[PDB]
């Protein structure tokens, strides 16, 4: 049998795209295959609870929703404090899957939403790259973005975070904008406006997006390639995007008042002026023409990206997070193995044949690369551009060398180059698979040791079933959503960090002596206190290595003038938990906690009894008594300790 | 005492029909709050009672609408719509001169 | 001192413009005038209902921009910059974008 | 269920086949009528 | 603080005025509706468009967004069909 | 600039940026240690300079070879050009792989 | 309160799942609880419970023992 050229071409494209989507979805689920399917890293538990609310209460009750189970002393309005796109997507998929009886719980939909959107991203990338050049580059870019390790790290099965869907939204908006620049039509600009609105609601990076379209338009102006198509497209996108972005509740009046959305307004005014001047330069003769010839500043989480010194030197709550440091070349290579070796070739092809849409992709690449160099968390937005460009690069080489072959209609150098390129591609596939398997898939609720000890879940379950219905527990901001999702009790601080005075209050309570801290706890009406210890299990990320950050945050706001972080070190400036430790550290409330009855438990073979694995030291105070606290519970490996705050002394005694 | 962390409101309870009932308006500040009664009198049993009450701020169906001070704006948009319609009847069906 | 050039340009504009384009320019002047009066009122009394001011104002700006884009696409001097955007398709896109904008403006005003 | 050592082998085989098929497509695209 | 009602009413009348100005300018040009011929597709299109705008007004007072979006979906589909037919006829007559 | 000077600036910028310059500035590392033995995200100045050099040289080899394909070129010089390109690319790739293996044990 | 749900399917097999709320009634606990004393002193903790065994009908094939919050890895 024989087939037409069109039939075989279509079959090849279809088969390649199907295999790429299946691989994208398949590669994402490694963690689900290992440990039981549960939402992890305790950032998405908030999103998960929110999604459940939207799935069992409706939208109108969700739009105006007041949560009294978090930040107890204050009030938290969840209906207008977060971008709602992810919850809406999950609830819509859930209702569609329930109309046709395919009944699936909300948790399974939340767990497997990110792989599905990662599968959609492949098709979107293919179409985007097809707009740039020959479809072959599109297939290559789709296949490469399928297996890229950074994107697979920030979106794994069981990780219900907003970045996953966000990337797909951003790529859709970029495709619509490229199609509007190439086509020059109002319809495509309106589609781009709607896509941009969706993107605004889904992620906090919409600001980023609205500072790349205007910059590109401005870059195009300088070059002199400005035409009516770009004017029409950008202006139509601007008006509708501004308005649609307004009505997201959390945003409010941010776009017209704030300073992150001023580049767009400036470029819009410049575009109007330029178009009118160009129109006036045609109706009048050259001699006549020559004769004629309260606002908010940068918020700060965006400013630190421009100036990478402010957040680390001034604000002790933004730099406290782990993945806020600059990225090294080793990390760059680990995330992308062969993509880095192809970025320059893609940039060269773009710079060699300048078009009206190439300039935009070049600008995207450059700016995104800088932002990836100034932060680890923004490596994500770098993976999508790279693939595209890398695809182009690789594709071009193939198309250059598969024409020199004699069989196609010295010559063997081209065959050698084809073999070399195939080797590069297969080794990139193997690298991506290994990096996905052995590094990126991991749970944060369970400590993998094969023996696993889930002390966190056990403590949360006890706290859920054996406390009064109104018991209030206070912990660090890290374990904020996790308690409410699993322990299901009223908490004091949370992982939002929108009121630094409250977190400073809790830090003061955790970093002072028992008298002052008991006063604080009585004032805030707290009942149980949950502190992670991890001294027996050897857990590096315990609630004692964060004590220094507690002190720094607490001794900052107008009441911790007596905290004086330089009072918890040794005379020479060390931080030891042994006898040589500071006499105020060994009497801190945090030290009385998570060391009660820990003085006489053997934890090693050739080591003294009162030994701490994580600090490799010997407790300074072996025996002490808690005057204001009872031990309510302690897990099996002493990983989580819950203490019940005591009452006032009945006979009115001191009880220091 | 109507208290959040420190008393926002503090009133007397008028004796009426065997019950101590007071009628008052909740403050502007939202959050969770606590009704509190404290009766410490010399020689009398100290009694203390606190009930917890959450105060929703507002709903989007309860904002004030049809403000007179915004009669201009409410008008303007509608005129625009009307304008568009007339355009869509004249721009299409017009005979050139 | 700069009135003769204005007289010349105004005279010329009329000759090189058809009926539909003159009609459209009249509509565009109406939009601009309504927006200017609204903004002047806002500068006179202030903004207590800020969202209503934004809604009513950007309705004017959006209708102005859609009118300008329709005018650009219709004018046959640019027939070489679109290549497939026929006048009827241009009017269709105008109606679609206008419906979206008016819906969002209504959903934003008080 | 499905052991990992199976999922990894499946992903490796699928990816290698995918890239080889994409390379083939480039040959087919260069030689058009 | 809020302005007196007299000022707001004055500005509302002033905002109504530009429409009158537009109409005067249009009759100065001489624009006519002579090409309209009462063809069924054109009449259906204009009726559906007017109904869509009236629905847009009604949504502001009573209907919520889901109901209004549903009604708009239906009316916009109808107006789209009528408009496709009418624009095809117009393109034929133009050439 | 004629779209070539800008490309040269972008190449220089890319090399320098992939050298972890921001890392060096924000967190001052000593020039040569004593490759971090167990810390993936760890950047000495010398190792980073060397690696970013490898990346840029690989891109240069690709463009240098890709250009070689142009017609009406003398064969004696084109053979040498092709040799340089193949050498640069293969060395860059194999080196970078070896470096990452040495820095992060257990690789693959 | 134990809820027993028995779903029958003519294609293959029948799957039974039961939710169990269970409570230790007598002699409620007063004072502090200490993991240390519980471990390093076998006397203390007499009235408490640690484990209990269920008997299944010898044809059970897919047992899972899930909680309301996730899997539980403590069973034999
Ligand atoms: C999601 O949740 C589910 C459900 O919770 C999780 O599944 C669970 O996973 C655990 C894994 O830890 C499984 O555990 C297994 O239980 C069996 C059964 O053991 C019982 O019977 C033994 C029988 O003993 C006989 O012989 C002795 C004399 O030797 C007699 O005295 C007896 O009377 C019997 O005749 C008995 O010995 C066991 O005793 C244990 O428990 C008591 C407490 O009651 C202790 O005091 C004892 O000291 C002892 O610990 C018990 O009563 C075990 O056989 C399994 O052991 C295998 O694995 C061990 C390591 O985990 C290993 O040490 C064993 O030697 C044994 O090894 C087998 O397999 C290896 C390969 O895997 C081989 O190399 C090896 O040769 C041998 O063949 C294990 O302990 C649960 O059954 C399982 N639950 C369910 C419902 O399926 C699931 O994991 C979760 N998912 C996650 C976490 O992702
Ligand atoms: C666009 C509009 C339509 C949208 C469609 C949305 C598609 C959603 C795809 C997700 C399907 C969920 C499947 C699933 O839940 O599997 C998981 C874990 O079990 C597994 O091993 C599954 C891992 C891989 C299965 C992936 C198949 C998904 C195919 C979808 C096309 C089960 O978790 P558990 O909660 O442990 O279920 C076990 C409970 N028993 C009592 C039954 C034992
Ligand atoms: C499949 C996944 C698609 C994801 C799309 C993402 C959408 C993000 C939603 C953001 C929510 C913003 C809140 C909002 O829009 O306001 C709601 C109006 O409530 C709504 O109508 C919500 C429906 C939003 C759908 C709008 C089209 C979105 C298309 C994006 C591709 C007010 O509803 P109402 O209570 O009806 O207010 C009208 C009252 N008036 C008297 C003023 C008329
Ligand atoms: C903190 C992060 C900051 C991010 C900064 C973003 C950097 C953007 C990277 C550069 C973008 C390249 C754009 C580009 O390709 O323009 C080139 C070369 O021509 C020029 O571009 C010269 C103008 C230089 C302006 C470059 C962008 C500046 C924008 C600042 C607002 C076009 O060359 P031309 O010669 O102008 O036009 C082609 C004519 N030929 C005959 C030569 C063919
Ligand atoms: C792609 C195919 C299948 C999907 C579909 O179009 C064609 O698009 C679906 C919509 O999402 C509709 C649901 C929205 C939520 C709404 C919740 C209410 O509660 C419930 O009463 C009705 C319900 C579930 C809607 C029913 C019809 C659905 C499933 C529509 C189908 C016909
Ligand atoms: C919930 C899921 C829904 C599906 C999806 O994920 C999320 O979300 C989809 C988007 O809507 C994408 C489409 C946008 C419109 C775009 C139009 C092009 O049509 C051209 O057709 C030519 C011949 O007539 C004309 O000449 C040209 O002018 C005209 O542009 C078409 O090629 C590509 C297409 C359809 C995009 C493909 C990928 C889609 C479907 C995305 C999926 C991944
Ligand atoms: C073209 C002009 C026409 C006149 C007007 O501007 C645009 O458009 C009117 C609206 O229809 C408004 C009414 C809606 C019903 C609403 C019922 C409430 O009950 C009542 O309190 C207020 C009321 C009557 C609104 C008052 C303002 C009106 C009349 C607006 C005018 C300013
Ligand atoms: C396509 C255009 C058609 C015209 C219009 O825009 C869209 O749609 C009109 C509505 O029908 C409004 C009237 C509703 C009844 C209401 C009765 C009260 O009694 C009276 O006070 C106000 C009144 C008449 C409303 C006034 C504004 C109207 C005419 C609106 C215009 C702006
Ligand atoms: C796509 C569109 C989006 C919207 C927009 O273009 C692009 O971008 C908007 C800007 O954000 C502009 C506002 C800035 C702040 C400025 C404060 C004034 O406050 C005055 O308050 C009086 C009370 O008495 C005093 O008398 C005065 O002195 C004092 O200046 C206010 O009147 C005007 C206001 C709000 C600007 C109006 C135009 C806006 C909305 C611009 C639009 C054109
Ligand atoms: C084809 C044209 C026909 C006329 C119109 O445009 C499209 O379609 C009308 C609707 O039927 C609207 C009425 C619905 C009932 C509603 C009852 C309320 O009670 C009352 O307050 C408002 C009222 C009467 C609506 C007013 C606007 C109307 C008349 C709309 C016009 C603008
Ligand atoms: C020619 C067109 C003109 C516009 C329209 O169609 C015909 O004529 C409107 C009617 O007035 C309808 C309302 C009646 C009262 C009914 C009260 C309920 O309470 C409410 O739930 C629904 C509501 C408001 C109806 C909704 C649809 C309306 C607005 C209809 C429009 C789509
Ligand atoms: C030059 C000049 C002055 C302006 C143009 C610069 C350009 C191109 C863009 C503006 C730069 C800027 C402020 C932010 C960059 C935005 C980026 C990279 C990512 C999104 C920002 C992060 C913090 C959101 C996630 O955080 P969360 O979701 O909230 O946790
Ligand atoms: Mg986040």
Curated annotation (Swiss-Prot), chain A:
Catalyzed reactions: a di-trans,poly-cis-dolichyl diphosphooligosaccharide + L-asparaginyl-[protein] = N(4)-(oligosaccharide-(1->4)-N-acetyl-beta-D-glucosaminyl-(1->4)-N-acetyl-beta-D-glucosaminyl)-L-asparaginyl-[protein] + a di-trans,poly-cis-dolichyl diphosphate + H(+)
Marked site positions, Interacts with target acceptor peptide in protein substrate: 43, 323, 546
Main location: endoplasmic reticulum
Tissue specificity comment: Expressed at high levels in placenta, liver, muscle and pancreas, and at very low levels in brain, lung and kidney. Expressed in skin fibroblasts (at protein level).
Cofactor: Mg(2+); Mn(2+)
Pfam families: AglB_core-like, STT3
Consequence when changing residue 250 to P: Confers resistance to inhibitor N-glycosylation inhibitor NGI-1
Motif (DXD motif 1): 41-43
Record pathway: Protein modification; protein glycosylation
Residue spans crossing the bilayer: 12-32, 114-132, 135-152, 164-183, 186-200, 206-222, 228-253, 262-281, 329-351, 358-374, 379-400, 411-430
Topology term for the membrane: Multi-pass membrane protein
Site-annotated residues for Important for catalytic activity: 154
E.C. number: 2.4.99.18
Binding site for dolichyl diphosphooligosaccharide: 377, 481
Name the UniProt record assigns to this protein: Dolichyl-diphosphooligosaccharide--protein glycosyltransferase subunit STT3A
UniProt source species: Homo sapiens (Human)
From Swiss-Prot, chain C:
Compartments where found: Endoplasmic reticulum membrane
Keyword Cell wall biogenesis/degradation: no
Assembly mode: Component of the oligosaccharyltransferase (OST) complex. OST exists in two different complex forms which contain common core subunits RPN1, RPN2, OST48, OST4, DAD1 and TMEM258, either STT3A or STT3B as catalytic subunits, and form-specific accessory subunits. STT3A complex assembly occurs through the formation of 3 subcomplexes. Subcomplex 1 contains RPN1 and TMEM258, subcomplex 2 contains the STT3A-specific subunits STT3A, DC2/OSTC, and KCP2 as well as the core subunit OST4, and subcomplex 3 contains RPN2, DAD1, and OST48.
GO biological process, one term: protein N-linked glycosylation
Cytoplasmic side: 1-27, 71-89
Topological type in the membrane: Multi-pass membrane protein
Name listed for the protein in its UniProt record: Dolichyl-diphosphooligosaccharide--protein glycosyltransferase subunit DAD1
GO molecular function, one term: enzyme activator activity
Record keywords, A-Z: Acetylation, Apoptosis, Endoplasmic reticulum, Membrane, Transmembrane, Transmembrane helix
GO cellular component assignments: endoplasmic reticulum membrane; membrane; oligosaccharyltransferase complex; oligosaccharyltransferase complex A; oligosaccharyltransferase complex B
Family: Belongs to the DAD/OST2 family.
Residue ranges crossing the lipid bilayer per the database entry: 28-48, 50-70, 90-110
Main location: endoplasmic reticulum
Pfam families: DAD
Pathway note: Protein modification; protein glycosylation
Species per Swiss-Prot/TrEMBL record: Homo sapiens
Intervals, Lumenal compartment: 49
Keyword Acetylation: yes
UniProtKB/Swiss-Prot annotation, chain F:
Entry keyword set: Endoplasmic reticulum, Membrane, Transmembrane, Transmembrane helix
GO molecular function terms noted in the UniProt entry: protein-macromolecule adaptor activity
GO BP annotations listed: co-translational protein modification; protein N-linked glycosylation; protein N-linked glycosylation via asparagine
Places the protein is found: Endoplasmic reticulum; Membrane
Extracellular domain ranges by topology: 27-44, 100-108
GO cellular component, one term: endoplasmic reticulum membrane
Cytoplasmic side: 66-78
Principal localisation: endoplasmic reticulum
Pathway: Protein modification; protein glycosylation
Membrane topology of this protein: Multi-pass membrane protein
Purpose of the protein: Subunit of STT3A-containing oligosaccharyl transferase (OST-A) complex that catalyzes the initial transfer of a defined glycan (Glc(3)Man(9)GlcNAc(2) in eukaryotes) from the lipid carrier dolichol-pyrophosphate to an asparagine residue within an Asn-X-Ser/Thr consensus motif in nascent polypeptide chains, the first step in protein N-glycosylation. N-glycosylation occurs cotranslationally and the complex associates with the Sec61 complex at the channel-forming translocon complex that mediates protein translocation across the endoplasmic reticulum (ER).
Family: Belongs to the OSTC family.
Name used for this protein in its record: Oligosaccharyltransferase complex subunit OSTC
Organism the protein comes from: Homo sapiens
Curated annotation (Swiss-Prot), chain G:
Subunit (UniProt): Component of the oligosaccharyltransferase (OST) complex. OST exists in two different complex forms which contain common core subunits RPN1, RPN2, OST48, OST4, DAD1 and TMEM258, either STT3A or STT3B as catalytic subunits, and form-specific accessory subunits. STT3A complex assembly occurs through the formation of 3 subcomplexes. Subcomplex 1 contains RPN1 and TMEM258, subcomplex 2 contains the STT3A-specific subunits STT3A, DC2/OSTC, and KCP2 as well as the core subunit OST4, and subcomplex 3 contains RPN2, DAD1, and OST48.
PTM section of the record: Ubiquitinated by the ECS(ASB11) complex. Ubiquitinated by RNF128, leading to degradation in a proteasome/lysosome-dependent manner.
Domain of life (superkingdom): Eukaryota
Gene that produces this protein: RPN1
Localization, UniProt: Endoplasmic reticulum membrane; Melanosome
Protein family according to the UniProt entry: Belongs to the OST1 family.
Protein name: Dolichyl-diphosphooligosaccharide--protein glycosyltransferase subunit 1
Source organism of the structure: Homo sapiens
Tissue specificity note: Expressed in all tissues tested.
Residues that carry a glycan: 71
